[PDB]
């Protein structure tokens, strides 16, 4: 368990210095991308029956 | 993240009384079942006892049946196990193990060597 | 054009469907069995009679094909790979004979598993002579590991056994009753247990498995018609 | 005739057909 | 005497991570989302029902062209269906009867399979000589195979059940890069849109992001209470959703290093078996053990529709590349298409 | 016509039999010859009675006629005459008993097809419930509805009207020919399911798969042979208008194997019952609790196997006991289709779950 301790602590150290942006702008990007491609979602907006292959 | 830490355990004379308490965190204590696991030095893993949800069904193994008392409550999110009638043959490391699934009773892989939800554990040893 | 493509697809569908019907006729004629148990239980002796993940054992008796699928190579955690054996006819369980408490807990976990409620299990109490020698020598004891043995009474109502130490008969029936108490504690009538006392050189194990499978199939057929 | 229970349905149809729509036989007087 | 200071360093680093996550968190995603209009009530019916499988279906993968899909079931059979005409294009008799996963190559030339044999097998379909056989068999894993995905025609990523992930390469048979660090069985994995990142949800209630090029983890998210059964990347590639056995769906962010929202309801407690996203990512289609699939609004965490058309529990589902339709597979050997 | 001549022929045939009885017989009153049945010697007995001769449709084999020697002289004609007023057998009291039974058959049969027309629809609509067992039930439900359909139309179209039978139409014979075969077809199908029950329980239980091409031949093809044999032997020997007669023994040809098949079905039920009680001995289930469900399993198997035709085979002569046997046998026969449908379709477990699950989806869609 002593070696696993060192490997875990070094893995956590590698995760300690990673960059983290504010949650607000991340959420902004997540819903901006969602609203940008809202038209291209057949499950969201129904496509006409003639166009769809599964009729 | 689940984090089960243990308390108590020390060098005491045989036949004494101790107390081990686990303060659950990172998850909801009421839904899950809880089991106790002992690690006898120089031997494999062993199962101690389990208590069902809300303290409904309580069972112990044969070696500790009629001796040990386990008690849990959902409000404090804590797990206790009474220590009494200590003998040198009971020297083992005790861990707080969580049930894999909520609202379920099978509760597999408690005895598995590598368990992610198992507590760190504290050494309990009786000597003179 | 699309006429020829559609025709070719139709004929390919027909051929694949015919092959699937043939494989369905073949598949429904065999019964899948899962061999499970703890280490040092003597199951390897039965396996050798006849690394990878699953060892296949194709054996037949009385013109009935049986497919036994030992799962030894997979890791100890069995919560995620035990859900696959929910369509098997029966699960063969081998008990090494506190090694008994671990087997009891594993059986309890298997019995009340949500996806394992339909399947029935076959109990095999392997290493009977080991229990006999252990109880005759007196070096070890069961009272410390089980504070109920002394008060337990041998079920003389039904214990047809050849001549042997009566203490070991009490021990065997005590283990059987301990298993049965967990088996029938939360049973809902959808799966049952079939305990059997066997040694490491018993050639009648296949016959016992055949009889247990016949009983399971008969019970399932009776339940399908609401008779049971 | 048939005295089995399977002929019960046929028996009722035959009995009703004759009774509902016949000639009636005089039991006594000139008749023996 | 070196154990205690290792433990103190680990807990200090964990506290530092908690403080950093708290500092970068100011407002939840729900607060910034309430201003947009809801999706409203939606309903999709079973357009096509696919029958012919003998045993329960565990996994499936839609094709790149949205024309063919492959399903794996416990009868030792691999079937390549035609979605539009419900025609069985191929029927590969598997040599292993306990296959747990399957994959479709982006080019459609190869397929993958894995189960309780620790061996991943690749089968060739473009060859036309009256025979379809396994091209390469990948051996070396200790735990059972759970899920495999195709990177290219010469690279495949497999997640076994021994807490390890290996990057294989076909036509050689040996492991190129091995990913280690998990403590529980890796149940499912998904590939990022750029084919450079991939996550893996193990049985330790955490999702760990790995790098294929160098071969070590980047970030760990945790945030769950039970084993993660499924995982799927967001279409943008900067987020993903996970499904566990405690009846909760959680969406994480690759940049915030923390969870964003939790999807759940009080009346239902069933382990999620599959998680998938639509084209825009607005709908979170997640399977459940209560014999039906629920559609969740990812942005608002509000249920939009219920898909109840399976007699048995849903074990596999996935939205096609163009998002035309979604197909879910249950344990009743029936495959259905929803649109 | 022909049936009237048969009664006259029987009157002439009884005279020859009466002559043999008088020759064989060597303070008894002299044995005189009566119109219908010659009376034996009674030593100045008063109100001595014998069974009704019943050569006429008016007469029945239940009543008895009596007189007193020193033989009864009719006051009107001042001549010997025997009291036959008790053999009319068409009093309104007994007609009312059959009147209730007639409407009981219509009510039971009409309700039987009601419960069965939608029971069959459920099995064919839900493909998930389909199985090897279901296919036999689908055929059994199919032959139950049509057989009940013929019974309803037979009692209201050809029975009430006497003008249809007098004209002697060929089509009427065909209608009864179809009725005879289809009615036996329903009863022969009980043995087909009885063999299936004996196949999946006690003997050859492991081999679940079995070809149904033999079951279809016995279910439908086999009943054609006795009906064809009965049809040809009736025309040559006893050809009555529309072939609706029951006073002939030739009906045993079609009703022989039908009774024989149900006799074999009785043995199959006993074998299944003995297996059921045997399985519980190993389970060690409570002695007082297994009795109630053991008869319950037998009770639900009676409508499916047609056991009631073997347990109560013959009508009793006693009026009160005969009244009971007519009320209960007709109730079980006419309501048999309803009993089968309500047990294997309206009481089955996985049928109930599918219906509830399907209804839950429908209310979600709407």
- How far apart are alpha carbons C48 and C55 in whole angstroms? 11
Indicate the helix (H) or strand (E) that contains C169.
helix C166-185
Do E273 and E289 contact (CB within 8 A), yes or no?
Answer: yes
Verify B-F touch: 3 or more CB pairs within 8 A.
Answer: no
F201 → closest Cβ in C192, C213, C222: C222
Task: Kindly tell me the burial class for residue E23, based on how many C-beta atoms sit within 10 Å of its own C-beta (0-12, 13-18, 19 or more).
Answer: exposed
Say yes or no for a CB contact (<8 Å) between B63 and C148.
no
Do F198 and F305 contact (CB within 8 A), yes or no?
Answer: no
Verify D-C touch: 3 or more CB pairs within 8 A.
Answer: no
Query: What is the stated resolution of the deposited model, in angstroms?
Result: 3.6
B109 contacts in chain E (CB < 8 Å): none
In CATH, what number is assigned to the domain containing residue F337? 1.20.1070.10
Q: Residue B8 in 3-state DSSP?
A: coil
- CATH architecture of the domain with residue range C36-224: 3-Layer(aba) Sandwich (3.40)
Do F81 and D24 contact (CB within 8 A), yes or no?
Answer: no
**Which tokens go with D32?**
């023996």
Q: What is the 3-state secondary structure (H, E, C) of chain F?
A: CHHHHHHHHHHHHHHHHHHHHHHHCCCCCCCCCCCCCCCCCCCCCCCEEEECCCCCCCCCCCCEEEECCCCCEECCCCEECCECHHHCCCCHHHHHHHHHHHHHHHHHHHHHHHHHHHHHHHHHHCCCCCCHHHHHHHHHHHHHHHHHHHHHHHHHHCCCCCHHHHCCCHHHHHHHHHHHHHHHHHHHHHHHHHHHHHHHHCCCCCCCCCCCHHHHHHHHHHHHHHHHHHHHHHHHHCCCHHHCCCCCHHHHHHHHHHHHHHHHHHHHHHHHHHHHHHHHHHHCCCHHHHHHHHHHHHHHHHHHHCCHHHHCCCCCCCHHHHHHHHHHHHHHHHCHHHHHHHHHCCCCHHHHHHHHHHHHHHHHHC
**Which tokens go with F318?**
């006693």
Residues of the domain holding F39: 2-87
E245 → closest Cβ in B1, B26, B101: B101
Say yes or no for a CB contact (<8 Å) between F361 and E311.
no
Quickly tell me which residue has 């009786």 as its tokens.
B126
In CATH, what number is assigned to the domain containing residue B100? 2.60.40.10
Q: What are the beta bridge partners of residue E307?
A: E293
**Residue C116 CB coordination number (10 Å):** 20
Dihedrals φ, ψ of E167, to 5°? -100, 105
- How far apart are alpha carbons E113 and E90 in whole angstroms? 15
- How far apart are alpha carbons E162 and B75 in whole angstroms? 37
The sign of the dihedral angle between the CA atoms of E49, E52, E53, E55 is positive
The length of chain F is: 366
Do F313 and D5 contact (CB within 8 A), yes or no?
Answer: yes
Do E145 and E100 contact (CB within 8 A), yes or no?
Answer: yes
* Statement to judge: residues F212 and F82 lie in one domain: no
Contacts of residue C27, Cβ cutoff 8 Å, sequence gap at least 6: E54, E75
- How far apart are alpha carbons F133 and F192 in whole angstroms? 12
Say yes or no for a CB contact (<8 Å) between E227 and B100.
yes
C-alpha dihedral, E54 to C226 to F337 to F141, nearest 10°: 10
Chain B: closest CA distance from residue C82 (Å): 10
- How far apart are alpha carbons E245 and C120 in whole angstroms? 25
Would you call E77 an interface residue with chain C, using a CB distance cutoff of 8 Å?
yes
Count A/E contacts: CB-CB distance under 8 Å: 151
* Statement to judge: residues F147 and F201 lie in one domain: yes
Task: Kindly tell me the burial class for residue E296, based on how many C-beta atoms sit within 10 Å of its own C-beta (0-12, 13-18, 19 or more).
Answer: buried
Task: Kindly list the partner chains of chain B, i.e. chains with 3 or more CB atom pairs below 8 Å.
Answer: C, E
- How far apart are alpha carbons C49 and C203 in whole angstroms? 10
Count D/F contacts: CB-CB distance under 8 Å: 108
Do A27 and E29 contact (CB within 8 A), yes or no?
Answer: yes
**Which tokens go with E236?**
């943008």
Q: What are the beta bridge partners of residue E121?
A: E113, E137
Q: What are the beta bridge partners of residue B124?
A: B92
* Statement to judge: residues F51 and F200 lie in one domain: no
**Which tokens go with E150?**
């195709």
| Of B101, B23, F360, B24, the residue nearest E248 (C-alpha) | B101
* Domains, chain E, with CATH or none: 2-339 (2.130.10.10)
Do E24 and E256 contact (CB within 8 A), yes or no?
Answer: yes
Say yes or no for a CB contact (<8 Å) between C77 and B112.
yes
Say yes or no for a CB contact (<8 Å) between C101 and B106.
no
- How far apart are alpha carbons C180 and F23 in whole angstroms? 84
- How far apart are alpha carbons E182 and E201 in whole angstroms? 9
- How far apart are alpha carbons E239 and F323 in whole angstroms? 83
Quickly tell me which residue has 């939360």 as its tokens.
C186
Would you call D6 an interface residue with chain F, using a CB distance cutoff of 8 Å?
yes
- How far apart are alpha carbons F69 and F31 in whole angstroms? 10
Task: Kindly list the partner chains of chain A, i.e. chains with 3 or more CB atom pairs below 8 Å.
Answer: E
* Statement to judge: residues F21 and F106 lie in one domain: no
Quickly tell me which residue has 């009466």 as its tokens.
F18
Contacts of residue B26, Cβ cutoff 8 Å, sequence gap at least 6: B1, B2, B3, E225
Integer distance in angstroms from the first to the last C-alpha of chain A?
Answer: 59
| Of A26, A36, A27, the residue nearest E31 (C-alpha) | A27
Say yes or no for a CB contact (<8 Å) between A23 and E216.
no
Chain B: closest CA distance from residue C124 (Å): 21
Query: Which ranges of B1-128 does DSSP label H, i.e. alpha helix?
Result: none
Experimental method reported for this structure: cryo-EM
Q: Residue B89 in 3-state DSSP?
A: helix
Say yes or no for a CB contact (<8 Å) between B109 and C78.
yes
Say yes or no for a CB contact (<8 Å) between D19 and F90.
yes
Q: Tell which of E18, E163, E164, E184 to mutate to test the B interface (max B CBs under 10 Å).
A: E184
A38 → closest Cβ in E33, E47, E282: E282
* Domains, chain A, with CATH or none: 2-54 (4.10.260.10)
**Which tokens go with B102?**
């909520």
A53 contacts in chain E (CB < 8 Å): 66, 83-84, 324
- How far apart are alpha carbons E45 and E48 in whole angstroms? 9
Say yes or no for a CB contact (<8 Å) between E77 and C80.
no
- How far apart are alpha carbons C73 and C59 in whole angstroms? 21
Contacts of residue E244, Cβ cutoff 8 Å, sequence gap at least 6: E205, E224, E225, E226, E227, E228, E229, E250, E271, E272
User: Where do the domains of chain C lie?
Assistant: 36-224
Q: Residue E191 in 3-state DSSP?
A: strand
Chain E: closest CA distance from residue B28 (Å): 8
- How far apart are alpha carbons B107 and E171 in whole angstroms? 42
Do E77 and E54 contact (CB within 8 A), yes or no?
Answer: yes
Do C60 and C24 contact (CB within 8 A), yes or no?
Answer: no
Angular region, F235: left φ>0, alpha ψ -120 to 50, beta rest: alpha
**Which tokens go with B72?**
């849990």
- How far apart are alpha carbons C121 and C89 in whole angstroms? 9
**Which tokens go with E229?**
């059964």
Could you give the strand order of the β-sheet that contains E155-160, starting from the edge strand earlier in sequence?
E145-152, E155-160, E164-168, E175-180
* Statement to judge: residues F307 and F332 lie in one domain: yes
Residue E220 CA to its chain's centroid (Å): 18
Contacts of residue E158, Cβ cutoff 8 Å, sequence gap at least 6: E114, E120, E138, E141, E145, E147, E148, E165, E166, E168
Are β-strands B122-126 and B11-12 bridged in parallel, bridged antiparallel, or unpaired? parallel
Residue F362 CA to its chain's centroid (Å): 43
- How far apart are alpha carbons F319 and F299 in whole angstroms? 28
- How far apart are alpha carbons F192 and F310 in whole angstroms? 17
**Which tokens go with F212?**
């149904």
Q: What are the beta bridge partners of residue E231?
A: E242
**Which tokens go with F126?**
């839900």
Do E226 and B101 contact (CB within 8 A), yes or no?
Answer: yes
Contacts of residue F173, Cβ cutoff 8 Å, sequence gap at least 6: F242, F243
Say yes or no for a CB contact (<8 Å) between D29 and F74.
yes
Q: What is the number of domains present in chain B?
A: 1
Contacts of residue C39, Cβ cutoff 8 Å, sequence gap at least 6: C96
Q: What is the DSSP string of A4-51?
A: HHHHHHHHHHHHHS-----HHHHHHHHHHHHHHTSTT-TTTSPPPTTT
Dihedrals φ, ψ of C64, to 5°? -125, 125
Q: What is the number of domains present in chain F?
A: 2
Verify F-D touch: 3 or more CB pairs within 8 A.
Answer: yes
Say yes or no for a CB contact (<8 Å) between A53 and E84.
yes
- How far apart are alpha carbons C150 and F60 in whole angstroms? 80
Q: What are the beta bridge partners of residue E241?
A: E232, E251
Do F39 and F65 contact (CB within 8 A), yes or no?
Answer: no
Are β-strands C55-61 and B19-23 bridged in parallel, bridged antiparallel, or unpaired? unpaired
CA dist C194 to C108, C181, F287, F357, Å?
Answer: 15, 13, 21, 34
Q: Which residues of F199-233 are buried (b: 16+ CB within 10 A; e: fewer)?
A: bbbbeebbeeeeeeeebeeebbebbeebbeebbee
B108 contacts in chain C (CB < 8 Å): 77-79, 82, 109, 113
Do E120 and E133 contact (CB within 8 A), yes or no?
Answer: no
* Statement to judge: residues F50 and F166 lie in one domain: no
Chain F: closest CA distance from residue E335 (Å): 13
* Statement to judge: residues F155 and F64 lie in one domain: no
Angle between helices F319-334 and F336-344 (to 10 degrees): 50
Do E199 and E231 contact (CB within 8 A), yes or no?
Answer: yes
| Of E90, E73, E57, E111, the residue nearest E317 (C-alpha) | E57
CA atoms within 13 A on the CB side of E111: 29
Q: Residue C167 in 3-state DSSP?
A: helix
- How far apart are alpha carbons C171 and C154 in whole angstroms? 8
Q: What is the DSSP string of E282-302?
A: -EEEE--SSSSEEEEETTT--
CA dist C154 to C82, C123, C177, F222, F282, Å?
Answer: 35, 20, 10, 59, 18
Chain C: closest CA distance from residue F274 (Å): 13
Angle between helices C128-137 and C166-185 (to 10 degrees): 120
CA dist B69 to B37, B65, B95, E161, F177, Å?
Answer: 14, 9, 16, 37, 83
C25 contacts in chain F (CB < 8 Å): 209
Task: Kindly tell me the burial class for residue F360, based on how many C-beta atoms sit within 10 Å of its own C-beta (0-12, 13-18, 19 or more).
Answer: middle
* Statement to judge: residues F101 and F61 lie in one domain: no
* Statement to judge: residues F63 and F115 lie in one domain: no
Could you give the strand order of the β-sheet that contains E68-73, starting from the edge strand earlier in sequence?
E57-62, E68-73, E77-82, E87-93
Say yes or no for a CB contact (<8 Å) between B116 and E184.
yes
F364 → closest Cβ in E291, E308, E311: E308
- How far apart are alpha carbons F339 and F141 in whole angstroms? 12
Nearest-Cα residue of chain F relative to residue C211: F206
Contacts of residue F243, Cβ cutoff 8 Å, sequence gap at least 6: F173, F176, F177, F234
- How far apart are alpha carbons C37 and C94 in whole angstroms? 5
Count E/F contacts: CB-CB distance under 8 Å: 13
| Of F223, F203, F208, the residue nearest F268 (C-alpha) | F203
Nearest-Cα residue of chain C relative to residue E271: C114
Nearest-Cα residue of chain C relative to residue F301: C227
């Amino acid at each position: 368990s002593i070696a696993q301790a060192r490997k875990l602590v070094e893995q956590l150290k590698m995760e300690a210095n990673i960059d983290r942006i504010k949650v607000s702008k991340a959420a902004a990007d997540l819903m901006a991308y969602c609203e940008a491609h809202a038209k291209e979602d057949p499950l969201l907006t129904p496509v006409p029956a003639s166009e769809n292959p599964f009729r | 993240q689940v984090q089960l830490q243990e308390s108590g355990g020390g060098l005491v004379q045989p036949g004494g009384s101790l107390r081990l308490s686990c303060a659950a965190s990172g998850f909801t204590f009421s839904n899950y079942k809880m089991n106790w696991v002992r690690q006898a030095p120089g031997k494999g893993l062993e199962w101690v006892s389990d208590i069902s949800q809300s303290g409904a069904s309580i069972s112990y193994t044969g070696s500790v049946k009629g001796r040990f008392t386990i008690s849990r409550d959902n409000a404090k999110n804590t797990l206790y196990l009474q220590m009494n009638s200590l003998k040198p043959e009971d020297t083992a490391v005790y861990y707080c193990a969580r049930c894999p699934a909520p609202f379920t009773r099978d509760c597999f892989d408690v005895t598995s060597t590598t368990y992610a939800y198992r507590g760190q554990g504290t050494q309990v040893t009786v000597s003179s | 054009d699309q006429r020829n493509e559609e025709k070719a697809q139709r004929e390919a569908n027909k051929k694949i469907e015919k092959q699937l019907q043939k494989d369905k006729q073949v598949y429904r004629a065999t019964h899948r069995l899962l061999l499970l148990g703890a280490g040092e239980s003597g199951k390897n002796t039965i396996v050798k009679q006849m690394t990878s993940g699953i060892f296949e054992t194709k054996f037949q008796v009385d013109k009935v094909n049986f497919h036994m699928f030992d799962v030894g190579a997979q890791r100890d955690e069995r919560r995620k790979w035990i859900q696959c054996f929910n369509d098997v006819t029966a699960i063969i369980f081998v008990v090494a004979s506190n090694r008994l408490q671990a087997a009891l807990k594993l059986f309890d976990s298997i019995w009340n598993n949500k996806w394992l409620r339909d399947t029935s299990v076959i109990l095999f109490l392997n290493k009977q002579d080991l229990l006999a020698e252990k109880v005759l020598a007196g070096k070890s004891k069961i009272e410390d590991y089980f504070p109920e043995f002394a008060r337990y009474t041998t079920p003389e109502d039904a214990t047809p056994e050849p001549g042997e130490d009566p203490r070991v008969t009490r021990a065997k029936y005590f283990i059987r009753d301990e298993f049965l108490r967990i088996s029938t504690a939360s049973g809902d009538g959808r799966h049952y247990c079939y305990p059997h006392f066997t040694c490491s050189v018993d050639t009648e194990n296949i016959r016992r498995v055949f009889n247990d499978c016949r009983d399971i199939i008969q019970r399932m057929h009776l339940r399908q018609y609401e008779l049971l | 005739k048939c005295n089995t229970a399977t002929c019960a349905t046929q028996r009722l149809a035959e009995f009703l057909r004759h009774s509902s729509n016949n000639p009636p036989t005089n039991v006594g007087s000139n008749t023996p | 005497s070196e154990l205690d200071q290792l433990r103190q360093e680990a807990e200090q680093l964990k506290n530092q991570i908690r403080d950093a996550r708290k500092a970068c968190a100011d407002a939840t995603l729900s607060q910034i989302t309430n201003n947009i209009d809801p999706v409203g009530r939606i309903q999709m019916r079973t357009r096509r029902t696919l029958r012919g499988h003998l045993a329960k279906i565990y996994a499936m993968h839609w094709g790149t062209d949205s024309r063919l899909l492959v399903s794996a079931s416990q009868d030792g059979k691999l079937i390549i269906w035609d979605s539009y005409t419900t025609n069985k294009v191929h029927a590969i008799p598997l040599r292993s009867s306990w296959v747990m996963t399957c994959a479709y190559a982006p080019s459609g030339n190869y397929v993958a399979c894995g189960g309780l044999d620790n061996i991943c097998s690749i089968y060739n379909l473009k060859t036309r000589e009256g025979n379809v056989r396994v091209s390469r068999e990948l051996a070396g894993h200790t735990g059972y195979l759970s899920c495999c995905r195709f990177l290219d025609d010469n690279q495949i990523v497999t997640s076994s059940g021994d807490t390890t992930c290996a990057l294989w390469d076909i036509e050689t048979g040996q492991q190129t890069t091995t990913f280690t660090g998990h403590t529980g069985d890796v149940m499912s994995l998904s590939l990022a849109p750029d084919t450079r990142l991939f996550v893996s949800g193990a049985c330790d209630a955490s999702a760990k992001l790995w790098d294929v090029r160098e071969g070590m983890c980047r970030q760990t998210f945790t945030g769950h209470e039970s084993d993660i059964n499924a995982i799927c990347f967001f279409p943008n590639g900067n987020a993903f959703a996970t499904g566990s056995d405690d009846a909760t769906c959680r969406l994480f962010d690759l940049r915030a290093d923390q969870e964003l929202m939790t999807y759940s309801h009080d009346n239902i407690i069933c382990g999620i078996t599959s998680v998938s996203f639509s084209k825009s990512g607005r709908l979170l289609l997640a399977g459940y053990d209560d014999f039906n699939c629920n559609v969740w609004d990812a942005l608002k965490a509000d249920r939009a529709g219920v898909l109840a058309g399976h007699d048995n529990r849903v074990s596999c589902l996935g939205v096609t590349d163009d998002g035309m339709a979604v197909a879910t597979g249950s344990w009743d050997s029936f495959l259905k298409i929803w649109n | 016509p022909f049936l009237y001549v048969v009664g006259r022929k029987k009157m002439m045939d009884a005279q020859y039999k009466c002559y043999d009885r008088m020759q064989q017989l060597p303070p008894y009153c002299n044995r005189t010859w009566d119109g219908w049945l010659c009376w034996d010697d009674t030593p100045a007995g008063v109100l001595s009675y014998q069974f009704c001769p019943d050569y006429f449709p008016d007469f029945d084999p239940s009543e008895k006629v009596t007189k007193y020697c020193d033989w009864f002289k009719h006051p009107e004609n001042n001549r010997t005459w025997s009291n036959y007023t008790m053999c009319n057998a068409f009093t309104p009291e007994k007609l009312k008993n059959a009147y209730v039974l007639y409407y009981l058959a219509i009510v039971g049969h009409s309700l039987s097809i009601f419960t069965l027309v939608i029971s069959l629809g459920i099995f064919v609509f839900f493909r998930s419930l389909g199985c090897q067992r279901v296919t036999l039930h689908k055929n059994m439900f199919l032959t139950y509805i049509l057989n009940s359909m013929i019974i309803i139309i037979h009692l209201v179209e050809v029975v009430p009207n006497g003008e249809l039978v007098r004209r002697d139409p060929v089509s009427c014979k065909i209608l009864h020919f179809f009725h005879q075969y289809m009615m036996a077809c329903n009863y022969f199908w009980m043995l087909c399911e009885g063999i299936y029950l004996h196949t999946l329980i006690v003997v050859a239980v492991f081999t679940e798969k079995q070809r149904l091409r033999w079951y279809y031949l016995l279910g439908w093809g086999f009943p054609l042979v006795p009906t064809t044999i009965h049809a040809i032997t009736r025309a040559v020997y006893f050809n009555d208008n529309c072939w609706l007669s029951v006073e002939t023994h030739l009906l045993y040809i079609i009703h022989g194997p039908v009774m024989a098949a149900l006799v074999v079905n009785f043995f199959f039920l006993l074998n299944i019952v003995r297996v059921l009680v045997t399985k519980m001995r190993e389970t060690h289930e409570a002695e007082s609790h297994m009795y109630l469900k053991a008869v319950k399993a037998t009770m639900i198997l009676v409508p499916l196997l047609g056991i009631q035709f073997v347990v109560f085979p013959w009508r009793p002569s006693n009026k009160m006991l005969g009244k009971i046997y007519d009320y209960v046998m007709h109730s079980l026969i006419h309501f048999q289709g309803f009993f089968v449908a309500t047990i294997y379709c309206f009481c089955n477990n996985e049928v109930q779950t599918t219906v509830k699950r399907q209804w839950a989806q429908f209310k979600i869609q709407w």
